[PDB]
Amino acid sequence: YSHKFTVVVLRATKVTKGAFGDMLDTPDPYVELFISTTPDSRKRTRHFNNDINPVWNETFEFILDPNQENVLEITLMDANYVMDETLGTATFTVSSMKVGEKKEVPFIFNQVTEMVLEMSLEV
Numbered sequence: 509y510s511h512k513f514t515v516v517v518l519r520a521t522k523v524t525k526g527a528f529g530d531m532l533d534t535p536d537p538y539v540e541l542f543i544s545t546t547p548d549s550r551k552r553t554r555h556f557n558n559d560i561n562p563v564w565n566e567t568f569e570f571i572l573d574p575n576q577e578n579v580l581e582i583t584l585m586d587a588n589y590v591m592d593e594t595l596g597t598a599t600f601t602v603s604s605m606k607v608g609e610k611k612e613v614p615f616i617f618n619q620v621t622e623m624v625l626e627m628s629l630e631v
């Protein structure tokens with residue numbers, strides 16, 4: 509744990525679903541931040557139900573060694589009441605990047621889903 513890696517889940521609007529999640533009400537947004545290199549990078553953001561235009565913009569720091577396979581395994585899911593439902597996940601190997609600034613990654617799922625993740629690398 510010697511490399512400074514900061515991530516910031518910005519937004520995740522136009523999150524599509526259908527009638528499935530609409531059973532109770534409009535889709536239920538909820539993020540799931542997962543990584544592969546740290547001891548146990550299994551964090552997430554518990555948002556709410558009925559919402560296709562949420563905004564977390566939460567910056568979580570992660571000082572870990574980039575010697576392993578730093579695979580930023582994020583996952584935009586749907587927070588249910590029994591079992592979560594993944595809608596669109598993302599993966600980005602940060603162990604090998606051009607550290608020096610932030611990173612506005614445009615991650616659109618399907619076609620209308622839009623989720624921007626701002627992560628800045630440093631050491």
Ligand SMILES: [Ca+2]
Pocket residue numbers: 529530532533534535536557558559
């Ligand atoms: Ca709902």
Ligand SMILES: [Ca+2]
Pocket residue numbers: 529535536557586587588589
């Ligand atoms: Ca749900």
